[PDB]
Amino acid sequence: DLADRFAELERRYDARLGVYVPATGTTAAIEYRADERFAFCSTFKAPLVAAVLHQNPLTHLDKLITYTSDDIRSISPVAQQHVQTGMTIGQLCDAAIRYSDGTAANLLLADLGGPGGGTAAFTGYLRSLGDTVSRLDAEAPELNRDPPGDERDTTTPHAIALVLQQLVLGNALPPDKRALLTDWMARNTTGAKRIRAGFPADWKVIDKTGTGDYGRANDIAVVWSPTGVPYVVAVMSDRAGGGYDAEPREALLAEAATCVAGVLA
Numbered sequence: 001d002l003a004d005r006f007a008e009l010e011r012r013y014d015a016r017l018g019v020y021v022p023a024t025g026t027t028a029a030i031e032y033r034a035d036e037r038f039a040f041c042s043t044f045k046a047p048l049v050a051a052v053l054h055q056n057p058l059t060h061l062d063k064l065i066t067y068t069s070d071d072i073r074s075i076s077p078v079a080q081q082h083v084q085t086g087m088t089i090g091q092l093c094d095a096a097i098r099y100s101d102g103t104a105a106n107l108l109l110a111d112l113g114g115p116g117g118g119t120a121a122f123t124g125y126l127r128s129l130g131d132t133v134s135r136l137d138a139e140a141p142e143l144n145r146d147p148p149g150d151e152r153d154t155t156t157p158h159a160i161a162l163v164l165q166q167l168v169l170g171n172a173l174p175p176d177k178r179a180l181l182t183d184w185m186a187r188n189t190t191g192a193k194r195i196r197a198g199f200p201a202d203w204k205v206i207d208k209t210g211t212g213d214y215g216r217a218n219d220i221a222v223v224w225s226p227t228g229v230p231y232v233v234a235v236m237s238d239r240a241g242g243g244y245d246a247e248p249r250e251a252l253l254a255e256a257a258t259c260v261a262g263v264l265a
C-alpha cells in the first residue's frame with residue numbers, strides 16, 4: 001500500500017511528505033498530504049519563467065539586464081559570474097531553471113514587475129491558471145525562511161502539479177514558448193538525486209527542484225514512459241522537527257519517486 005510506504009518514509013526521515021500525481025487515462029491520481037501547504041522554495045521558478053515568456057514577445061529573451069553587487073543576496077552560481085557584463089532575459093531564465101539561480105529569479109520577478117517586486121504578478125499568473133491556492137509573498141532569500149505552518153510563499157503538491165501539467169502538457173503557453181520551458185527543465189542540473197533517481201533510465205524526466213530551511217526539499221517533474229506516456233509528479237518535504245537548520249534529505253524524494261515509479265510502470 002502506497003500510503004503506508006509514504007508514512008514509513010516520513011518516520012525514517014523525521015519528515016512531513018507530500019505527493020501528487022494527477023489522474024490520467026488509466027491511472028488514478030496519486031495523493032499523500034497533497035492538499036497540505038509546503039513552501040515553494042525554488043520550485044516557483046518554473047511557473048515564473050512561464051510567466052515571463054507568456055508576458056513578452058519571444059525576442060524579449062535577447063534583452064540585456066544589468067545588476068550590481070547588492071543584488072547578490074542568495075545562492076546564484078551563474079549571476080555572480082556576470083555582474084559586470086549583465087545577463088539577457090534568456091540567460092536569466094536558463095540560470096533560474098537549470099542552476100536555480102536566486103539572483104536570476106529575483107531579476108525575472110522584477111522584469112515581470114508590479115507590486116511586491118513582481119510577487120503579486122507572479123501570484124496573478126497562477127490565478128490565471130486556475131490555481132487559487134498558491135501564493136508568493138517574498139523573493140530570495142526570504143521566501144525559503146517562513147516558519148513551518150506559515151502560509152506565506154506556499155503551494156501544495158496538488159496545486160503545483162496541476163500548474164506544471166498546464167505549462168508542459170497543456171496549452172498555457174504557445175508551442176514555441178512551451179518548448180523553451182520544457183527544454184530548460186530537461187537540461188536541469190540540480191535534480192539528479194530526486195525524482196530522476198526514482199525512475200528507470202528509459203523514462204524521460206524534466207524537473208525543477210527547491211531547497212529551503214527547516215529541512216525543505218521539493219522536486220516537481222514531468223516524466224514520460226518508454227512509450228511516450230506522460231505523468232506529472234510533485235514531491236514536497238520538510239523536517240520541522242530539526243528546526244531552522246534541519247538538513248534537507250534528497251534521499252526521501254528519491255525513495256518517494258521510486259514508490260511512484262513502481263505504481264506507474
Ligand SMILES: *C(=O)[C@@H](N)[C@@H]1N[C@@H](C(=O)O)C(C)(C)S1
Pocket residue numbers: 041042043075099100101102144190209210211212
Ligand atoms: C531554491 O530552492 C534555492 N534554495 C535554490 N534551489 C535549490 C535546489 O534547487 O535544490 C538549490 C540548488 C540547493 S539553491
